[PDB]
């Protein structure tokens, strides 16, 4: 019935163009971002309780929001972590495939299932449910160059001007801002408050009075009096708009009168809303903003617009303000597009340079110049109807698609020139006859090569999210190949062709080929004593098949089983970890050195040392700094020594020389949606309720068990911070009432002077900013500064905190990390240089099952998706190939042919198990995608062999000998015509060490030796089973 469509010529020329013109729109409708939405949908409930503790920030805030979490809709884990800055990050991560849009809805239908079980200050402080797919877009830093602007001067300028203009640049669906805006920080001065007999109660009370916007109303308001002609709208006290207009905030009656100024007791100034973050970019103060790209993930035209939007703001910048981009996606995206669209077009030209080895013609050879881009632009087109973004995973879903479009078109070409170049008859003799022998085969060529990708397109997890970006891309590469092979190929293999003489395979044509076009077949005629010499006595040649399998079975479990490689992402985060209770001054003092380290020792590589003090991935506070150390292009970073893993090893080694801090220096994971670090993320459970010491000391038994294997487990470290000293102040509460003070004069004094307290809003350049009272810094540093705070009694006399409040010191863990209502302690760690996570995570599983029941081990984050790959990814081969084990019986009409063609499969499995370890690469996800590319290549050639053997017994009547002297001797030539196309499609990748093509050449060399097994081995092993299994069955 596709043969009925052959004799309509221009029907077939241009339906190829239909799939291209729709694909010509697919340029104008595909979002492009190199890592799409592949994370499990997580939700970060970012609370706040400023100045507060950590032992009872989980109890005011977190244990309330944790205790509404009744049966979370398609949940995997809810981890939260309160800390010493009063920050809570409840992280509800859900099942993959569950709608992230309903998630942020349903989290605030789990939180806002049962809100006012909240002590209601939980939401009164300001909580922010957010779909924190913790991938970013560009993480634009904004620095001052000369030094006039401080940090906080920048961070307000960004949030007053940039953020509201960047958060509606298209593609941006989230602007996170760093760190915060200005806020009229009211630094109180307790040796001025005692001078006026005030407390911070009456400092706050006047600011909630005189700085209050009052709905006055209207002259001539509604309803009027009969006889009205005047309408106004009364301005009462506005929100007070400046530092000086808080300066004259009144406190009392003043018969001292220069009316009692709030600027006589409180040093008014602007400043940030928290100072836990000091971001010194190259030792120079900076704000930042972390952009997160919306669904509609078009990272090009967003960043093509954002880098324009910054250039619109460069006229608006004050003195010395500079924009630098520490992290990005696009210089890791842009050249990976424009090469792998050109390489893709080069592979189109390489396919023409395949048949410059085979055809050496113009009009008969111009067929895949049209036939290849139709499968390509249609793969853009159908995925644009199925919602799959241009990324790695569908540009590498198109380079792997090159091997699936050459199996149809170019295979017809020598089957057509089986009649011309080998027999000398017109192409009409090859138009219907040669297609008619394979029209029933392209039923199965389309069948068995889409069949092995069926279960991965439906399986869940991020492993399933990687697969669905691969599988339906190859399926669209398959389904728009058989729908092109049965249309476009016959009208180009019957109409515009050239008559060629008989016996001429290019002998008198351009030198080196003519001596070789015999000599390949002539060595194949010396290989005829291997064609026949294998197939006669097949007894010894069956134990040779186990030699293929013993090499498979031994070099697969010994092959290291990682999950994702370390991508050279152009940045690497260096985190700092001071003693428990070390200040923001000292952590900055180390990030003086580390920036001086990365700008004297590695200035040839390092772009920049955007160094956020205080904040840290895996842990906040003041003892923990981090540096987003960024790199250059690979053209400026040559060789193995200037990749990340060589830099961070030089970093960490010279950081052991750096006193005062365990300064790790690690790399981001491959996909940035999941991990703080790469490697793994060893969580921990409160199984029985062991408390806090043995909670910590089985974790110290863990580093007694897991850090003492230093060869494999490199830098196994905790996340939950060591028990810092906490400063208990025993408000000797009866003295704190017998002296005359009400304790609300005390807890407001003790907790809005030391604390930092929101008061109200104010107006600043027409923008709402917060009003914070706090002590001035030199009056809250020490336990001595307890004694300087004065509280007012009943009778107006002033009492010091040292008169009653007996201070002391205690333990306290700031990062009280929880898990679904269970306290926990997270543990990080990488794997060995040259080894993998699976020989490190299961090594941890040797060292996590050591503990008794009572404190359990959990594997989630990056560690869930590899715990899910360990449960389905080699188990993918079962239900994939058993459908292929049942596809053959439909094609070959026997139970016993699936005993044969299902044993072409481990020929190329060992083809890739060699090419990995011959360069030293691991069993990641892509290696298996290389295997499913390789297994596709093995079964592809068998249909040109074994379905042809089905075809011979009807149309030419051949046993084994006459079959093999015509099947194998002649139909091995089109197998080369796919071999030189696809496997040389990674020829620009063999010499490429840039945008993470390392484990992608183990695919290409793996299919090459898999083609070597297709070159000698696979063209016998079903005819080996013609002399044994067809002898048996």
């Amino acid at each position: 019935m596709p043969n009925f469509f052959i004799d309509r010529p221009i029907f077939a020329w241009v339906i190829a163009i239909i799939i291209m013109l729709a694909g010509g729109l697919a340029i104008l409708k595909l979002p492009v971002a190199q890592y799409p939405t592949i994370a499990p949908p997580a939700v970060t409930i970012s609370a706040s309780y400023p100045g507060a503790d950590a032992k009872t920030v989980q109890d005011t805030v977190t244990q309330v929001i944790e205790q509404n979490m009744n049966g979370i809709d398609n949940l995997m884990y809810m981890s939260s972590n309160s800390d010493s800055t009063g920050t809570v990050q409840i992280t509800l991560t859900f099942e993959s495939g569950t709608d992230a849009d309903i998630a942020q809805v349903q989290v605030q239908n789990k939180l806002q299932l049962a809100m006012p079980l909240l002590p209601q200050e939980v939401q009164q402080q300001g909580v922010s449910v957010e779909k924190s797919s913790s991938s970013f877009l560009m993480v634009v830093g904004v620095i001052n160059t000369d030094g006039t602007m401080t940090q906080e001067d920048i961070s307000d300028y960004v949030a007053a001007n940039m953020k509201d203009a960047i958060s509606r640049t298209s593609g941006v669906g989230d602007v996170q801002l760093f760190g915060s805006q200005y806020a009229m920080r009211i630094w109180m001065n307790p040796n001025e408050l005692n001078k006026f007999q005030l407390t911070p109660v009456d400092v706050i009370t006047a600011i909630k009075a005189q700085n209050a916007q009052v709905a006055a109303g209207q002259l001539g308001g509604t309803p009027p009096v009969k006889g009205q002609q005047l309408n106004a709208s009364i301005i009462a006290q506005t929100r007070l708009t400046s530092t000086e207009e808080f300066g004259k905030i009144l406190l009392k009656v003043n018969q001292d009168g220069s009316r009692v100024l709030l600027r006589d007791v409180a040093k008014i100034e602007l400043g940030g809303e928290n100072y836990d973050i000091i971001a010194e970019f190259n030792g120079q103060p900076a704000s930042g903003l972390g952009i997160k790209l919306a669904t509609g993930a078009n990272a090009l035209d967003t960043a093509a617009a954002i880098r324009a939007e910054l250039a619109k703001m460069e006229p608006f910048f004050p003195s010395g303000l500079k924009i630098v981009y520490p992290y990005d996606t696009t210089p890791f995206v842009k050249i990976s597009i424009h090469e792998v669209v050109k390489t893709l077009v080069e592979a189109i030209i390489l396919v023409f340079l395949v048949m410059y080895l085979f055809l050496q013609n113009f009009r008969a050879t111009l067929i895949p110049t049209i036939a290849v881009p139709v499968v390509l632009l249609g793969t853009f087109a159908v995925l644009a109807a199925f919602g799959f973004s241009i990324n790695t995973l569908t540009m590498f879903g198109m380079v792997l698609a090159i091997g699936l479009l050459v199996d149809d078109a170019i295979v017809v070409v020598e089957n057509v020139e089986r009649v011309m170049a080998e027999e000398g008859l017109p192409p009409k003799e090859a138009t219907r006859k040669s297609m008619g022998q394979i029209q029933g085969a392209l039923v199965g060529i389309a069948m068995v090569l889409s069949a092995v990708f069926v279960p991965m397109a439906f399986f869940g997890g991020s492993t399933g999210a990687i697969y669905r970006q691969f599988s339906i891309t190859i399926v669209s590469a398959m389904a728009l190949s058989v729908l092109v092979a049965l249309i476009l190929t016959p009208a180009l293999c019957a109409t515009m062709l050239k008559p060629i003489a008989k016996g001429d395979h290019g002998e008198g044509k351009k030198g080196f080929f003519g001596w070789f076009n015999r000599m390949f077949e002539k060595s194949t005629h010396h290989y005829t004593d291997s064609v026949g010499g294998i197939l006669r006595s097949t007894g010894r040649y069956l134990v040779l098949y186990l030699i293929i399998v013993v090499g498979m079975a031994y070099l697969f479990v010994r092959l290291p089983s990682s999950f994702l490689p370390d991508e050279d992402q152009g940045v690497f985060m260096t985190m700092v970890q001071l003693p428990a209770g070390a200040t923001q001054e000292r952590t900055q003092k180390v990030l003086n050195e580390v920036t001086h380290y990365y700008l004297t020792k590695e200035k040839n590589n390092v772009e920049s040392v955007f160094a956020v003090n205080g904040f840290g991935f895996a842990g906040r506070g003041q003892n923990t700094g981090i540096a987003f150390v960024s790199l250059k292009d690979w053209a400026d970073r040559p060789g193995e020594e200037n990749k990340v893993e060589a830099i961070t090893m030089r970093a960490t080694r010279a950081f052991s020389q750096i006193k005062d801090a365990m300064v790790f220096a690690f790399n981001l994971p491959a996909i940035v949606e999941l991990g703080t670090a790469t490697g793994f993320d060893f969580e921990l459970i409160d199984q029985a309720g062991l408390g806090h010491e043995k909670l910590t000391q089985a974790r110290n038994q863990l580093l007694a068990e897991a850090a003492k294997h230093p060869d494999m487990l490199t830098s196994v470290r905790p996340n939950g911070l060591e028990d810092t000293p906490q400063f208990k102040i025993d408000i000797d509460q009866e003295k704190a009432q017998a002296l005359g003070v009400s304790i609300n004069d005390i807890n407001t004094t003790l907790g809005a002077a030391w604390g930092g307290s929101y008061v109200n809003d104010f107006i600043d350049r027409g923008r709402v900013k917060k009003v914070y009272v706090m002590s001035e810094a030199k009056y809250r540093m020490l336990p001595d500064d307890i004694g300087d705070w004065y509280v007012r009694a009943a009778d107006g006399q002033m009492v010091p905190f040292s008169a009653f409040s007996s201070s002391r010191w205690e333990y306290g863990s700031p990062r009280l990390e929880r898990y679904n209502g269970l306290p926990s302690m997270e543990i990080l760690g990488q794997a060995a240089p040259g080894k993998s996570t699976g020989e490190a995570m299961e090594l941890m599983e040797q060292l996590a099952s050591k503990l008794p029941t009572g404190v359990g081990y959990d594997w989630t984050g990056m560690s869930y998706q590899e715990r899910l790959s360990g449960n389905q990814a080699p188990s993918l081969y079962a239900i994939s190939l058993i459908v292929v084990f049942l596809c053959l019986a439909a094609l070959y009409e026997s139970w016993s042919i699936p005993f044969s063609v299902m044993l072409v499969v481990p020929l190329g499995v060992i083809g890739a198990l060699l090419a990995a370890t011959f360069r030293g690469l691991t069993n990641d996800v892509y290696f298996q995608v290389g295997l499913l590319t390789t297994i596709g290549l093995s079964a592809k050639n068998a249909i040109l062999i074994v379905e042809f053997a089905k075809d011979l017994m009807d149309k030419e009547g051949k046993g084994l000998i006459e079959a093999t002297l015509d099947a194998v001797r002649m139909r091995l030539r089109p197998i080369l015509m796919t071999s030189l196309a696809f496997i040389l499609g990674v020829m620009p990748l063999v010499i490429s060490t840039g945008a993470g093509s390392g484990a992608q050449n183990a695919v290409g060399t793996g299919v090459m030796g898999g083609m070597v097994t297709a070159t000698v081995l696979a063209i016998f092993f079903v005819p080996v089973f013609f002399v044994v299994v067809r002898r048996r069955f």
Binding site: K342, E346, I349, L350, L353, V354, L357, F512, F516, F520, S523, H526, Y527, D529, S530, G533, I534, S537, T538, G539, R540, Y541, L542, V543, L544, L980, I983, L984, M987, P988, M1008, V1012, T1015, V1016, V1028, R1032
Partner: protein, 46 residues
Amino acid sequence: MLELLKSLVFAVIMVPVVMAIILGLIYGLGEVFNIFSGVGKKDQPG
């Protein structure tokens, strides 16, 4: 526009060289694919 001049001179040398190492495989080891001569047929079921 330079890598199409690369793939003029480096896709005219790395197409026959990959065609040449397989000749060191399929003709060099193809002779050792015929050094093995014998029968070991596992016809124990038959």
